[PDB]
Write a protein that holds these residues in place. Structure first.
Motif, PDB file in Angstrom:
ATOM      1  N   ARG A 178       0.876  -1.176   0.000  1.00  0.00           N
ATOM      2  CA  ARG A 178       0.000   0.000   0.000  1.00  0.00           C
ATOM      3  C   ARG A 178       0.903   1.212   0.000  1.00  0.00           C
ATOM      4  O   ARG A 178       0.425   2.334  -0.026  1.00  0.00           O
ATOM      5  N   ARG A 179       2.200   0.948  -0.228  1.00  0.00           N
ATOM      6  CA  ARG A 179       3.331   1.809   0.032  1.00  0.00           C
ATOM      7  C   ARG A 179       4.101   2.182  -1.209  1.00  0.00           C
ATOM      8  O   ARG A 179       5.317   2.203  -1.218  1.00  0.00           O
TER       9      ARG A 179
ATOM     10  N   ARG B  23      -1.106  -7.146   3.883  1.00  0.00           N
ATOM     11  CA  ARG B  23       0.036  -7.376   4.804  1.00  0.00           C
ATOM     12  C   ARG B  23      -0.405  -8.148   6.121  1.00  0.00           C
ATOM     13  O   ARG B  23      -0.179  -9.356   6.312  1.00  0.00           O
ATOM     14  N   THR B  24      -1.054  -7.446   7.047  1.00  0.00           N
ATOM     15  CA  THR B  24      -1.765  -7.929   8.253  1.00  0.00           C
ATOM     16  C   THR B  24      -2.841  -8.985   7.811  1.00  0.00           C
ATOM     17  O   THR B  24      -4.036  -8.767   7.547  1.00  0.00           O
ATOM     18  N   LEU B 195       5.858   0.784  10.989  1.00  0.00           N
ATOM     19  CA  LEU B 195       4.676   1.354  10.335  1.00  0.00           C
ATOM     20  C   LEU B 195       5.229   2.636   9.716  1.00  0.00           C
ATOM     21  O   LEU B 195       5.709   3.522  10.445  1.00  0.00           O
ATOM     22  N   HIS B 199      -0.844   8.185   7.135  1.00  0.00           N
ATOM     23  CA  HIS B 199      -1.480   9.456   6.930  1.00  0.00           C
ATOM     24  C   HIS B 199      -0.294  10.267   6.587  1.00  0.00           C
ATOM     25  O   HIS B 199       0.478  10.739   7.436  1.00  0.00           O
ATOM     26  N   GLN B 217      -4.437   9.976   2.854  1.00  0.00           N
ATOM     27  CA  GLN B 217      -4.264   8.872   3.727  1.00  0.00           C
ATOM     28  C   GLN B 217      -4.135   7.741   2.779  1.00  0.00           C
ATOM     29  O   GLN B 217      -5.122   7.453   2.131  1.00  0.00           O
ATOM     30  N   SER B 219      -3.301   4.045   3.285  1.00  0.00           N
ATOM     31  CA  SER B 219      -3.735   2.750   3.733  1.00  0.00           C
ATOM     32  C   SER B 219      -4.627   3.148   4.897  1.00  0.00           C
ATOM     33  O   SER B 219      -4.216   3.771   5.890  1.00  0.00           O
ATOM     34  N   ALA B 220      -5.903   2.841   4.679  1.00  0.00           N
ATOM     35  CA  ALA B 220      -6.995   3.197   5.556  1.00  0.00           C
ATOM     36  C   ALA B 220      -7.860   2.033   5.917  1.00  0.00           C
ATOM     37  O   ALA B 220      -8.481   1.428   5.025  1.00  0.00           O
ATOM     38  N   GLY B 225     -10.074   2.137  11.720  1.00  0.00           N
ATOM     39  CA  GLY B 225      -9.107   3.189  11.778  1.00  0.00           C
ATOM     40  C   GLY B 225      -9.764   4.355  11.173  1.00  0.00           C
ATOM     41  O   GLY B 225      -9.761   5.369  11.832  1.00  0.00           O
ATOM     42  N   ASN B 229      -9.888   8.541  12.321  1.00  0.00           N
ATOM     43  CA  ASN B 229      -9.133   9.474  11.541  1.00  0.00           C
ATOM     44  C   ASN B 229      -9.855  10.710  11.128  1.00  0.00           C
ATOM     45  O   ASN B 229      -9.286  11.780  11.020  1.00  0.00           O
ATOM     46  N   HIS B 259      -9.474   0.056   2.676  1.00  0.00           N
ATOM     47  CA  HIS B 259      -9.799  -1.363   2.620  1.00  0.00           C
ATOM     48  C   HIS B 259     -10.620  -2.001   3.716  1.00  0.00           C
ATOM     49  O   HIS B 259     -10.300  -1.695   4.869  1.00  0.00           O
TER      50      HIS B 259
HETATM   51  O1  LIG Z   1      -3.118   5.396  11.825  1.00  0.00           O
HETATM   52  C1  LIG Z   1      -3.318   4.335  11.222  1.00  0.00           C
HETATM   53  N1  LIG Z   1      -4.483   4.168  10.440  1.00  0.00           N
HETATM   54  C2  LIG Z   1      -4.838   3.027   9.695  1.00  0.00           C
HETATM   55  O2  LIG Z   1      -5.958   3.007   9.129  1.00  0.00           O
HETATM   56  N2  LIG Z   1      -3.872   1.953   9.786  1.00  0.00           N
HETATM   57  C3  LIG Z   1      -3.907   0.710   8.904  1.00  0.00           C
HETATM   58  C4  LIG Z   1      -4.356  -0.558   9.585  1.00  0.00           C
HETATM   59  C5  LIG Z   1      -3.701  -1.676   8.848  1.00  0.00           C
HETATM   60  O3  LIG Z   1      -3.753  -2.897   9.633  1.00  0.00           O
HETATM   61  C6  LIG Z   1      -2.273  -1.008   8.780  1.00  0.00           C
HETATM   62  C7  LIG Z   1      -1.251  -1.653   7.869  1.00  0.00           C
HETATM   63  O4  LIG Z   1      -1.115  -0.974   6.538  1.00  0.00           O
HETATM   64  P1  LIG Z   1       0.221  -1.201   5.598  1.00  0.00           P
HETATM   65  O5  LIG Z   1       0.272  -2.658   5.234  1.00  0.00           O
HETATM   66  O6  LIG Z   1       0.016  -0.344   4.407  1.00  0.00           O
HETATM   67  O7  LIG Z   1       1.278  -0.768   6.552  1.00  0.00           O
HETATM   68  O8  LIG Z   1      -2.653   0.299   8.191  1.00  0.00           O
HETATM   69  C8  LIG Z   1      -2.746   2.025  10.526  1.00  0.00           C
HETATM   70  C9  LIG Z   1      -2.417   3.173  11.253  1.00  0.00           C
HETATM   71  F1  LIG Z   1      -1.270   3.223  11.899  1.00  0.00           F
END
Ligand SMILES: O=c1[nH]c(=O)n([C@@H]2C[C@H](O)[C@@H](COP(=O)(O)O)O2)cc1F
Ligand SMILES: O=c1[nH]c(=O)n([C@@H]2C[C@H](O)[C@@H](COP(=O)(O)O)O2)cc1F
Lengths: 316, 316
Positions: A178-179, B23-24, B195, B199, B217, B219-220, B225, B229, B259
């Protein structure tokens, strides 16, 4: 049609447009907060309602895609979009080898004086830029531009990062990241900047097959600059998709302040009497791959049937 | 109602949601490219369709607004949102003064073993964090976080920039700047980051009277989350407006990949049987001004009538 998005913004800032005093002084019609989406599989989003140059676009995108800050490539690509800018280092000249160029613009809107001198002086500058390695070194070189921001991030602890490519290899190895963002907004730099990058950040996405892009563009000139911006990033979407072995999907354009100028209202309205025409096709060369190595004819834009160009004033 | 925007995203990723592996690990429903706009003069956008804590929000916003990377403030504000994170420097412990905490999470979804040990171990960590200056120094301190990104940009040539405030004084001296952006996406840093900031960037705007904000933002997490936000940046919109002597307008939320998780579908659907209730009011204290000096009760949120909390799994 594929471009009706932009005619919906053109009508919207005319309709709901609030006056906000702007920098480049006419006064403007602003909106804040706007997204626009283009399905790049139905066409290439160059505007059929007005003649937007696919050629000058092309030459400046490649400049960015290499890492260049230098004016000489673009100069020898008949591309002058960043020219008036090498000339900042001409005009403040401790090497002033001559005359009136003292404030160039503004009264270059005014016919002899700063006007046609400055104008014959562009060849003076644009000659040594192009033929004098030394000159080219120094006044033809725009330090931070798009080019070194995307490709040579002056890192803190003495070095450089190539966000684009480093990102391209994550678009190839880890797709669903997502990066995949490339920023042009570096805090350090922005205190001292004549143009701080209007196209702040963008982010790549691949969703079951397709390379989508989103743009965060903060200051967007709806008549004169947005038409291009859609095409230089649909282009990138295509350039990158074709490195990675992907199909294309959408280009998302998000604006911060998307503004009309007061002296471009009558024209944007002129554009809006015309109906769209079916959008172009974009065919890049199938053999070339490193998008970094692409040159001018590895991208043709077929079928561009546009209404005439409408002609501005300026946005300054 | 004021929050129907978020229930329109909740329905949209359920409806047009594409599966994308995330990812998660559950797997997710993605969209890419989404803007949402909230008129902060009709209310405060905390969600009446579900109980979102205005309290924990509050304590983490202030942490950001000071410059803190340290876990101890938030810990003594009963705020644990960033807690599991001081614990990265606990778990990799060359100072392991003890036992199983070796991979904490994941099997903390699994009842005795990594599960309730880890959990009694939070007080072990959260004690020295809060009572041991030395501990607090080292393992309670999240280097780059929101806080130092917005306030102490580790500059290249040995120093720090305060984007927020430097921006606040441009929101006070030059209002119509199209240049009021604070970024959290620093290229250098992002290669090594557990992380990287979800944002990424936001930008301020003042249009005839009002402080608008837009968020980029990337990845939401729509269930868990996004609710927050909206409220932590409507809060900022208000905090900053009230420093500058402005009225409020809108909060624009733009998402990259917004997502749903696969294991939060049944719940988001649960939320969607409920109708909204009239949004809150936000009254900050009229005497305090330096938003930097605000504390917990310089912000009350009145009239929060919410449906119960719905309870997740996790997004990991
Ligand atoms: O402030 C935040 N807001 C948000 O919506 N996430 C989301 C939740 C998701 O589990 C996490 C991982 O995203 P990525 O794989 O892009 O790091 O991003 C994480 C935060 F820190
Ligand atoms: O690539 C660009 N795209 C764009 O739309 N502008 C606009 C035109 C406007 O005249 C200029 C000034 O904006 P600001 O006052 O925010 O610098 O931004 C400038 C660029 F460089």
């Amino acid at each position: 049609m594929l471009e009706q998005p932009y005619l919906d913004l053109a009508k919207k800032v005319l309709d709901e447009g609030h006056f906000k005093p702007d920098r480049t002084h006419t006064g403007t019609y602003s909106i804040f907060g706007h997204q626009m989406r283009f399905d790049l599989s139905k066409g290439f989003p160059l505007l059929t309602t007005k003649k937007v140059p696919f050629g000058l676009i092309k030459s400046q995108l490649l400049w960015f895609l290499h890492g260049d800050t230098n004016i000489r490539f673009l100069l020898q690509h008949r591309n002058h979009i960043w020219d008036e800018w090498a000339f900042e280092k001409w005009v403040k000249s401790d090497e002033y080898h001559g005359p009136d160029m003292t404030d160039f613009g503004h009264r270059s809107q005014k016919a002899p004086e700063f006007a046609a001198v400055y104008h014959e002086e562009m060849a003076k500058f644009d000659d040594r830029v192009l033929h004098d390695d030394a000159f080219a070194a120094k006044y033809g070189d725009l330090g931070l531009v798009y080019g070194s921001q995307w490709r040579a991030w002056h890192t803190s602890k003495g070095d450089t990062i190539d966000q684009l490519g480093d990102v391209i290899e994550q678009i190839k190895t880890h797709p669903y990241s997502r990066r995949l963002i490339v920023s042009a907004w570096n805090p350090e730099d922005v205190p001292t900047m004549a143009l701080p990058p209007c196209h702040t950040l963008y982010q790549f996405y691949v969703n079951d097959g397709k390379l989508s892009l989103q743009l965060y563009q903060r200051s967007a000139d709806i008549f004169l600059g947005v038409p291009f911006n859609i095409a230089s990033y649909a282009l990138l979407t295509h350039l990158v998709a074709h490195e990675c072995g992907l199909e294309v999907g959408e280009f998302i354009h998000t604006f911060g302040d998307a503004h009309l100028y007061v002296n471009h209202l009558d024209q944007i309205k002129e554009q809006l009497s015309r109906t769209p025409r079916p959008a172009p096709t974009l065919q890049l060369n199938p053999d070339k791959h490193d998008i970094f190595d692409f040159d001018m004819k590895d991208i043709k834009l077929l079928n561009y049937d546009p209404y005439p160009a409408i002609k501005a004033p300026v946005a300054v």
